[PDB]
Amino acid sequence: SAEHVLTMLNEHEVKFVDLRFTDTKGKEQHVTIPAHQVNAEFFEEGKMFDGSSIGGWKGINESDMVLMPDASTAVIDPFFADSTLIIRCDILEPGTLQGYDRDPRSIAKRAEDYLRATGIADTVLFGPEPEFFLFDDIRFGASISGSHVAIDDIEGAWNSSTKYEGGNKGHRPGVKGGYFPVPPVDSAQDIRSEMCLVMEQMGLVVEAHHHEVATAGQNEVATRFNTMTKKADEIQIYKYVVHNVAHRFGKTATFMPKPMFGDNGSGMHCHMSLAKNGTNLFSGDKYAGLSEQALYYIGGVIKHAKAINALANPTTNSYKRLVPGYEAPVMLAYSARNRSASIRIPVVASPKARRIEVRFPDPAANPYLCFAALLMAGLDGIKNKIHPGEPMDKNLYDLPPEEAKEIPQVAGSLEEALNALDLDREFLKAGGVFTDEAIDAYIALRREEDDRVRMTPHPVEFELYYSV
Amino acid sequence: SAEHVLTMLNEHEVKFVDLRFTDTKGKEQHVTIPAHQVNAEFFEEGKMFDGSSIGGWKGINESDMVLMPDASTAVIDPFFADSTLIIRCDILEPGTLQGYDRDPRSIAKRAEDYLRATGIADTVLFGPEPEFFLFDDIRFGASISGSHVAIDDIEGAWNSSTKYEGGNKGHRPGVKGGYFPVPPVDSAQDIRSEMCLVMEQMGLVVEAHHHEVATAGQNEVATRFNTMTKKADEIQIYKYVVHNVAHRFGKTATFMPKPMFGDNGSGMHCHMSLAKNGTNLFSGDKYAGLSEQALYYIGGVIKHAKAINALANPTTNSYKRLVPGYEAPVMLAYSARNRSASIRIPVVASPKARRIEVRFPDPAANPYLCFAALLMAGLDGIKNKIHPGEPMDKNLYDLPPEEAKEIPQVAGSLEEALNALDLDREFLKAGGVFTDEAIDAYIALRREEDDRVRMTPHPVEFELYYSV
Amino acid sequence: SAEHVLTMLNEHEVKFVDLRFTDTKGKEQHVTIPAHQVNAEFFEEGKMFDGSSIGGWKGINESDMVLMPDASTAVIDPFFADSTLIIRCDILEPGTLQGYDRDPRSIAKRAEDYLRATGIADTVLFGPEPEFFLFDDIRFGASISGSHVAIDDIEGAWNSSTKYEGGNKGHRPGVKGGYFPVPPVDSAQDIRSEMCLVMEQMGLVVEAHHHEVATAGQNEVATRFNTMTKKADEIQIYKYVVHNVAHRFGKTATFMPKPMFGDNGSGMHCHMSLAKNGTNLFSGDKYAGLSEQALYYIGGVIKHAKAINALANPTTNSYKRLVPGYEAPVMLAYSARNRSASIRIPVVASPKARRIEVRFPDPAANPYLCFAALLMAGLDGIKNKIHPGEPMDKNLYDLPPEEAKEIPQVAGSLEEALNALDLDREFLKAGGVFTDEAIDAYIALRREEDDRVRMTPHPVEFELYYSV
Ligand SMILES: Nc1ncnc2c1ncn2[C@@H]1O[C@H](COP(=O)(O)OP(=O)(O)O)[C@@H](O)[C@H]1O
Ligand SMILES: Nc1ncnc2c1ncn2[C@@H]1O[C@H](COP(=O)(O)OP(=O)(O)O)[C@@H](O)[C@H]1O
Ligand SMILES: Nc1ncnc2c1ncn2[C@@H]1O[C@H](COP(=O)(O)OP(=O)(O)O)[C@@H](O)[C@H]1O
Ligand SMILES: CP(=O)(O)CC[C@H](N)C(=O)O
Numbered sequence A, B, C: 001s002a003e004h005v006l007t008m009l010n011e012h013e014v015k016f017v018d019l020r021f022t023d024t025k026g027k028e029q030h031v032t033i034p035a036h037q038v039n040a041e042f043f044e045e046g047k048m049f050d051g052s053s054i055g056g057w058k059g060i061n062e063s064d065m066v067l068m069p070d071a072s073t074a075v076i077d078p079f080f081a082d083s084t085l086i087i088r089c090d091i092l093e094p095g096t097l098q099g100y101d102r103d104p105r106s107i108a109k110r111a112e113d114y115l116r117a118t119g120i121a122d123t124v125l126f127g128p129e130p131e132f133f134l135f136d137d138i139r140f141g142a143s144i145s146g147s148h149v150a151i152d153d154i155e156g157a158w159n160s161s162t163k164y165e166g167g168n169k170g171h172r173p174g175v176k177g178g179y180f181p182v183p184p185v186d187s188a189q190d191i192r193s194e195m196c197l198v199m200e201q202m203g204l205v206v207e208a209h210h211h212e213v214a215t216a217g218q219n220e221v222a223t224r225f226n227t228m229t230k231k232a233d234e235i236q237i238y239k240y241v242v243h244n245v246a247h248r249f250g251k252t253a254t255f256m257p258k259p260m261f262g263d264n265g266s267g268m269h270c271h272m273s274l275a276k277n278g279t280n281l282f283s284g285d286k287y288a289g290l291s292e293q294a295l296y297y298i299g300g301v302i303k304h305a306k307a308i309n310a311l312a313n314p315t316t317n318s319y320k321r322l323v324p325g326y327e328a329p330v331m332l333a334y335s336a337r338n339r340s341a342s343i344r345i346p347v348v349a350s351p352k353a354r355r356i357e358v359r360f361p362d363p364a365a366n367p368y369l370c371f372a373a374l375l376m377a378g379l380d381g382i383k384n385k386i387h388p389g390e391p392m393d394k395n396l397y398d399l400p401p402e403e404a405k406e407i408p409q410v411a412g413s414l415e416e417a418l419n420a421l422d423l424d425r426e427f428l429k430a431g432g433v434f435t436d437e438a439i440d441a442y443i444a445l446r447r448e449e450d451d452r453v454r455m456t457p458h459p460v461e462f463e464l465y466y467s468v
């Protein structure tokens, strides 16, 4: 929308333009330009900027990259005081201009191209269910003499005892209590509803909202699926709207996977299906109404799971969630019934809506990278006709070791997930989607994060070992 | 009102739709959907959702159920910020679609069907008097090192001594003092009146309101009776309006049966009568203007009392109320005079208003389940011509052991009430209204709640036993 | 000393007898008996007691074991108010009476027997350097809403800024500053000297004491070596004296491996050598004055390292220490020079003192188990002539990846060390020293400890991931 955008500036008396793009870890970045700085060439050649002080784009020598505006992504920021227009950008290589090896958005697009290229399908569909928490106060820190973390929300079950300024009104969700109680137990209708209204104003399509299992404000807003790349965009918008609406209500939102222990962690399940000329390639006559195609996808996903983990579970914390008992599946199996399975097959009337849901991904995942990895492992399962085996229609979390069931499982730690992506990197490099250093850079970043957690004493260690 | 609802969306520029239904324990649940998500098929096939993380619907394998909107139940939420429409839903079995075994609302409907089926009558009438308290502050908790509870209201008699920011204005209801003093002793006219206005706006019909016996804000709002199922609906609305209006006035409401000790507990008396073609089957020429029919109903209720208790007194706390001296009857007898009797026969001019009042039910009861149990025990008393014996026209609470009167009485504890429902489950399974696992599931839930109270040391035990 | 002990009761007007023994994790346990309860048979048949409520001896059915006093171990407790005599006991199987499979002390003795049995040598020598810290205040905890740890000592470098009641006297050890400054920088001469005096009074032989590298009171007391089993005894006494003298000085001691981060962790290096008829089998004409024998020992130790880790590094915290830069070697190599090597060969004048020092063990290790594992891996290296390869005389911590040196290294985590001991369990079962369930029980215990740390969110995760 080069043209569309120009009209849109006059239509909203736009004063600024916010250029946004996404870094390797997944954090959305931005830069502001006065509306007058937006002209003809701005669209065809973008603007100059130094990526050097960005995570893993480093190159305090060569990485002077280009921000390439995407006329289609334009939309007003609903939080900023002065009328500003947001425009998602792509990171292009200077001069060459075809797309940075490390730009996650470019990588996602590359993967979408390769899909049409292998002729397997013409569009990928993603529908993620990104969960989160809403707190009132969050404090933490680490120093040589100690470390800590403190969470607090009005909904926190621990506050049943707490004294309040104007009295304790006591209607709080108990542990795992947070599912669907009517207000006042659910302090957040009005909040979620805003996030919804806003998200829609920003282009997303809201299917629904509701409180979620855990005490202390766990909530979820369900949004309608979309083409893989546009969806990862929407995810960033989602998080923004969430983070900010929360902020504006004097709350603080977090998409971290396992903030509290002992309370059903926040996760981002991934619904997928492939299409070709308006037809859903995932419907057929095999298990649950699935096509042959889908099962190969499943086989791929299951094969490359640990590697995919590194993208869809990029945090040490991610692994604190992936445990039995909290609606977090670790078992690399599929089923329409059994919910101990990380891949669940939604049962549904028509064939138009047949698909798969890969439940192990969490919020912290870089949408673009995570989605691509899912897609590429799916394609590899198809090309190589990888059979997913038989569906799990047995028992839930720890009924299994009756024959000590050791069926495939997601990565146990982050080091694992990483090292796996190191080795099993082949399916990602296909179609030149992922490049080696793009992948080696990511591994490096996460490796240093993992170091911190692995090296800093944990409070519990004192509980367990001080009196040793 | 499939049609009606659509018009109602445009009429109120409705932005959202709140789907509400009721869980096993009785807690109303909800989920929000954008108004645009409401279409043609939404009404005929409902929406999909996982019940797994709900009390006793568990089935982390098969329980992927359907929310079936009931076009008639539609009404605006008066508390939500963005214009939203509420719609009560039924929980249907996927595919089969005729009604979940454990959906309390389905069970209530089943029981109403069975009434017309036995041809005994064509409609059941329920008129409950649900009492409650309004506090300013409520705190409590239990940990290994102790436990506690602290209540506080501006009306609390204990505050006669308390120092206040702008001075203590001292007009408080004494113990059992809270009946009908004119303000300012009664700090709640304006509050109750709101609850009334609102309740009416939400479809209920208010007959009256007044403060109630106990100090510390006990209050009651009397609402007009209705067909058994529609009434249990109204109860949920009632509680909502109460809970929320209270909240909005900086108060906190509780429908728990016995919050404080030493002060006439909150209860939900149940007025009932059966009808057939506009005629009141409960009027006749026997005791107090009653029909033969009514007395068989009474006999049934009295026979199945302990089992009914499990539904109409689902809490350990419920049994802290059922004691002499606080207008809580334990004696399983009937009378128009003596108010020591749990069933009281309201005396009234015409025959059009003849009925019975079963006083032992409390607030905590799942309306649907509780009502059904009452109805089914009534029907069983009729089919089997169970005679209620002679009316109690003697003395009140402890004049009786003169011949150590041991006439039938309501369950002494919860374990009892439960175990009773276990055994005497037959009259409930009639007409396939209650199913075994529906009943076995309920018992299980309550059994774990009872465990907690039974296993956690009580403060009083220290008072009584520490120096042992 | 059945006889000796009796005289010793009259000699000190002993009032009580403290029976002590050691649990699986390594924690010394005790039970008190009046001196009069000590008689003739007490020595030959011990006393009865239930082990059931002890870590991994569980058996709430069969584990009613015997405490078998060891007349030799008798010595007065210097801290107890009433004159009491301590007596180390062995845990024997009831009736059979030859020694519990899980009694770590029995296991240590078994291993010493097997040494003389293989005729390889007649006595094993252990000289451990167990380091520790002395704080003034230690607080920590974990709950659903958070977790934390707080360390504090008068020596803590962080206190340079801290305000004190009678003024801040500011002579504190900086980070890694804590090595040998003269008081007042070293607030602990008098303290260590007491621990020394006491330790000696309790039978140990003190070679020396000194402050140690880390700020916040890290200290060490060097004690003279002894026969493997008697030494692990002395370790327990050591820790006791330390823990208690500290306590009595208003301090609090901890032998946990890595309390603080950023400051040279506390470790327990293990000097070893074998003997036969007063001759030191570890001296020869090979590297550094070593015998052939020693190098096979080294080879064994290096081969079984990861398994040995599970015994000599039983804590998740243990692995927070095993990192470059803090005098904690991870490299499974030997050298007399290079101190990047986990096995260091002390250079020394005579042959009488030739030996090896395995530096990776830490304090938290169960002396008995840890020592045995070291010994058994040493013996296996000898029987199977396992060559230790060439000594490391190269560069320190990260000069190596020049050819990305991947020489053998100690376990990276605890799960690893455990799983390793699972598999490589063979050399331990030799001579029936370690039994399968003895080993399977240990693994189980530690597995649940590891679970806690692995499952509880770490403060740093918030620092790193909250704003994700
Ligand atoms: N191919 C597809 N056809 C239809 N819906 C899809 C498809 N691929 C993904 N979806 C997504 O399914 C998700 C929504 O439903 P949700 O109620 O949150 O399910 P769950 O019960 O698993 O949490 C949306 O993101 C929806 O758009
Ligand atoms: N069949 C019936 N005919 C008339 N009123 C009925 C019938 N069944 C139930 N009722 C109910 O009696 C209740 C109201 O009166 P209330 O003043 O609160 O009495 P009480 O003095 O026992 O607290 C209402 O719920 C009313 O609608
Ligand atoms: N066979 C042996 N002959 C002599 N000393 C030995 C032998 N085996 C172990 N040792 C022990 O070496 C340890 C002491 O010295 P230390 O000064 O703490 O050394 P480091 O500089 O490595 O910390 C003691 O525990 C000592 O008794
Ligand atoms: C589908 P659901 O709502 O039961 C929850 C998933 C869980 N929050 C997660 O951590 O994945």
Ligand SMILES: CP(=O)(O)CC[C@H](N)C(=O)O
Pocket: B131, B264, B265, B266, B267, B268, B269, B321, B326, B327, B328, B359
């Ligand atoms: C009819 P009423 O107003 O005298 C009171 C009943 C009593 N609150 C309850 O616990 O049942």
Ligand SMILES: CP(=O)(O)CC[C@H](N)C(=O)O
Pocket: C131, C264, C265, C266, C267, C268, C269, C321, C326, C327, C328, C359
């Ligand atoms: C021999 P040294 O005094 O230099 C120290 C060893 C170190 N504290 C550890 O963690 O082993």
Ligand SMILES: [Mn+2]
Pocket: A129, A131, A212, A220
């Ligand atoms: Mn969810």
Ligand SMILES: [Mn+2]
Pocket: A129, A269, A357
């Ligand atoms: Mn889902």
Ligand SMILES: [Mn+2]
Pocket: B129, B131, B212, B220
């Ligand atoms: Mn009343």
Ligand SMILES: [Mn+2]
Pocket: B129, B269, B357
């Ligand atoms: Mn009444």
Ligand SMILES: [Mn+2]
Pocket: C129, C131, C212, C220
């Ligand atoms: Mn040292």
Ligand SMILES: [Mn+2]
Pocket: C129, C269, C357
């Ligand atoms: Mn040393």
